[PDB]
Design a binder for these strands. Structure first.
Ligand SMILES: Nc1ncnc2c1ncn2[C@H]1C[C@H](O)[C@@H](COP(=O)(O)OP(=O)(O)OP(=O)(O)O)O1
Ligand SMILES: [Ca+2]
Length: 430
DNA sequence: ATTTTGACGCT
DNA sequence: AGCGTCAA
């Protein structure tokens, strides 16, 4: 009752760029705009592996992970843009720089947590309070929410997409209580107004479109964001949670898309997030551990307490290359050459990072996969990163991994290496 | 033969 | 530390 927390204390948004790498390439090359297209890495093997797909191409069934030759079977007119290759490997610099463009715009509005290259969480609580004081009881017009969906609406007593959106927005605003500056629903609505403004600024200043979710915590904001892509935003209110969760597969909730979510389904014999409400906190803790159990107990009721972390820059800078099938590195000299290529890219990015962000990495992490091991990483070792020097970093990585080689003749490498990974970590101010 | 990335938890 | 999970 009067002491039961409802997790309505914050306004949190999750901005997710639409088909991001595709949009970067379409901005650069207008011939690709409004076409079925995709972004591919490499080209020799089966036309290259697709890593991003425009919505026009998705309509044909083109997906990520697909080989371009196979995506051409579904979409013969598919256009392609290739990731730049440098030093013998794919180089993602263009997309990292476009990400900085968007993150810097978002940072003008609020503190952001960079979740990935094209996703950021925004804590809008303070900005919403300020805007509510400015509005000073004035109602919120539907014109201020031109691309917003209210999840769950319309309901109760037009066959067009936009018609449904406006019809739902009207019901929401009609019911909204603008008197109460502390009303969580009003706070979310003002949050959505601010996110419309943020998304307009991103599109104006970069050309890039995005989707967004607005709710009371990060998990609901992420879920909301995915409900109406592309180029739309969705408000998930606390009151919308029971219906929304009643048919929501557990795997759709962030962190439950893998083994833990599978175990929740198998152990409890349920399918949907809402069914979790029927277990006590101690029951969930008994099956999934103290932390996961408490998290699930609150999350299935719409309550998540994870903060939006004040962090705009990545905490690590890494470079990796796979060596699949017969191309696995089987000689020592070969291993050293690829470590040098990786270390040269890493040096370049680290030097730029140091100049831009006033920080220095202090640890180098070296990871490898051996041919036959199914695990993503077979071995991980660290050494000091004391100089931004590609020859030194590559020599040091070799030093830390050279004893993994079983071959009695050093010139040969066995078992063959199927992946090399260098990552700079543990930044200190400089 | 998806590849190339980040962030965070466990012991 | 080194390994594993989950996600762009
Ligand atoms: N598995 C992957 N491997 C390599 N790059 C990836 C992978 N997944 C995503 N990316 C890249 C390319 C994407 O443009 C970018 C953002 O990813 P993601 O948000 O999942 O999809 P997306 O932005 O392309 O489409 P959407 O509109 O559905 O968000 O990160
Ligand atoms: Ca995206």
């Amino acid at each position: 009752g009067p002491h039961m927390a409802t997790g309505q204390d914050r306004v949190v948004a999750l901005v997710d760029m639409d088909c991001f790498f595709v949009q970067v390439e379409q901005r650069q090359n207008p011939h690709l705009r409004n076409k079925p297209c995709a972004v591919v890495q490499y080209k020799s093997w089966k036309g290259g592996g697709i890593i991003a797909v425009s919505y026009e191409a998705r309509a044909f069934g083109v997906t990520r992970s697909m080989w371009a030759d196979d995506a051409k079977k579904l979409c013969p007119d598919l256009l392609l843009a290739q990731v730049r290759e440098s030093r013998g490997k794919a180089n993602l610099t263009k997309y990292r720089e476009a990400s900085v463009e968007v993150m810097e715009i978002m940072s003008r509005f609020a503190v952001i947590e960079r979740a990935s290259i094209d996703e950021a969480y925004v804590d809008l609580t303070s900005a919403v309070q300020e805007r509510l004081q400015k509005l000073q009881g004035q109602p919120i017009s539907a014109d201020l929410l031109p691309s917003t969906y209210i999840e769950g609406l319309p309901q109760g007593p037009t066959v067009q997409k936009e018609g449904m959106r406006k019809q739902g927005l009207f019901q929401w605003l009609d019911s909204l209580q603008i008197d109460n500056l502390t009303s969580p629903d009003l706070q979310l609505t003002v949050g959505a107004v601010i996110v419309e403004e943020m998304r307009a600024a991103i599109e104006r200043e970069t050309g890039f479109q995005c989707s967004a979710g607005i709710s009371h915590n990060k998990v609901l904001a992420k879920l909301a964001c995915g409900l109406n892509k592309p180029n739309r935003q969705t408000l998930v209110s606390h009151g919308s949670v029971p219906q929304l969760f009643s048919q929501m597969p557990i795997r759709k909730i962030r962190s439950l898309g893998g083994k833990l979510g599978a175990s929740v389904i198998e152990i409890l014999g349920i399918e949907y997030m809402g069914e979790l409400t029927q277990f006590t906190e101690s029951q969930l803790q008994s099956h999934f551990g103290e932390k996961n159990g408490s998290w699930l107990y609150a999350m299935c009721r719409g309550i998540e307490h994870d903060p939006v972390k004040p962090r705009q820059l990545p905490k690590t800078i890494g470079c990796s290359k796979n060596f699949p099938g017969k191309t696995a590195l089987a000689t020592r000299e070969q291993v050293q050459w690829w470590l040098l290529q990786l270390a040269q890219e890493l040096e370049e990015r680290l030097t730029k990072d140091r100049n831009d962000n006033d920080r220095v990495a202090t640890q180098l992490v070296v990871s490898i996969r051996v041919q036959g091991d199914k695990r993503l990483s077979s071995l991980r070792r660290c050494c000091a990163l004391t100089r931004y020097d590609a020859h030194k970093m590559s020599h040091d990585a070799f030093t830390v991994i050279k004893n993994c080689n079983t071959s009695g003749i050093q010139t040969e490498w066995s078992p063959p290496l199927t992946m090399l990974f260098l990552c700079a970590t543990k930044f200190s101010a400089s």
